[PDB]
Amino acid sequence: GAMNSSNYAELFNNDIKLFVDDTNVYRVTVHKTFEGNVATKAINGCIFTLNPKTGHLFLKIIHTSVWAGQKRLSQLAKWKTAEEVSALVRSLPKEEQPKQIIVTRKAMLDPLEVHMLDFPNIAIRPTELRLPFSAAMSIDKLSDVVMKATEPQMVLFNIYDDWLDRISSYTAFSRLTLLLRALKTNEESAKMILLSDPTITIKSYHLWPSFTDEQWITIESQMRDLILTEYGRKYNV
């Protein structure tokens, strides 16, 4: 059923699973019209589908053309997400298909379940974790590929870079969620933490800087400090 703090190590066992986040699929800017009314202008979006054990990210880029002439776009976005996730699963060899798909927003449950009726042995589940995956578009290289796309496209990343050579997937996921929570909390400050130092670079085939083990501890501490502060600033404590 629902996923929470009690069954948290289940994410890192050997049953293939995917998180799906739809929060960046349908994205708009709201602006005034010449007549003084308000209109939206869609921009490119993405489905964030992540294997938390391996770090494999299936980034489906949602080009604005998919909304042309469509109504009720925020509802359509959930069904388009489910259609794309279902298509991804069918394209995977059987032994690579997930045994569970965990959606970060409960509104995705019915669209995904309907689209996956052919896969009765794939459990569709919600979660009670407050995951920071909406901040994925704060990762510069992910933002860049989404905004440059001129057509629908699927782009594959490893969101853990090479971390699994030195740490477990539990630790890698905690690191990822901390980085992304910080980015979602105060993007500018988070990005300053990560890039302040010109001598630590991002390899061309990576998303995050090449921190040593010792530097990651420092970075992680800084992200905690950021989040705990913003938490006080907002509630005053």
Binding site: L76, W79, A82, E83, D110, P111, V114, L117, D118
Partner: protein, 300 residues
Amino acid sequence: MNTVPFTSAPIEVTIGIDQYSFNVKENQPFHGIKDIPIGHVHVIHFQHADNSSMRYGYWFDCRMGNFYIQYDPKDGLYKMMEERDGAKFENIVHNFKERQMMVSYPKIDEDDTWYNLTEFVQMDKIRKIVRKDENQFSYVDSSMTTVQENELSDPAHSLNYTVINFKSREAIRPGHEMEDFLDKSYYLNTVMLQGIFKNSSNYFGELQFAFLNAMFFGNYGSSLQWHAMIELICSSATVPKHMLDKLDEILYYQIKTLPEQYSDILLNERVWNICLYSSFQKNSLHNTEKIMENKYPELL
């Protein structure tokens, strides 16, 4: 006008006949029910004074044979039986009528309630939902489960209602997932009406039968079925106009007849609010919406 005689009444029992009911005392000289209107199905049902567990009863049509009730002290219930000897039967009935040992089906001549609750209900369709083919009448009780319920356990004693499931491949065309889930017109009109039921009268008959089993026996699987069949119509953008108008009448009379003290377990708040206020047909059920709002405004 036809007659269901009783051999006797050895245990104290509340007997129902359609929407009427009366109390019989242990060993009271009660020998049955007379003046039963021909042309409609009927249900004769029982609640023992000593056991409010298990309401049970029999659906029947007096045109299909001569039926009587006889208490069975082994199985502990009043059993319907068919008498094949027609002269024996007339002779028994005439004697008990002459002794005035029968209650009269108490229909008021202005009253179309029973017809309105059973307009589309036929014995031949009841007998396919309730499989017991050596008998012309059909036994139902509180505890019988539906075919759908057993899929989620004795099959002989089940209610074989048409399975409706909104998240099923039958309900959802490949490539039309969003369309068919948010507009059930395909599932209603092609799958169910054209494919399974053949016409809306058979659809309405099963819906009316489901409600009546829910109301008279507290059969929970029947209540589920009634609500599912309503929800399927209400959630379809495209419904024949005559079906909407008839649905409104059907439901009006069901809501009018439901005991007020059972409304909290026989009416599903989610379905009714969706149907009257959110669905495609939210403005098509004027009679039903008006009675629901004046009788059960709390639910909503």
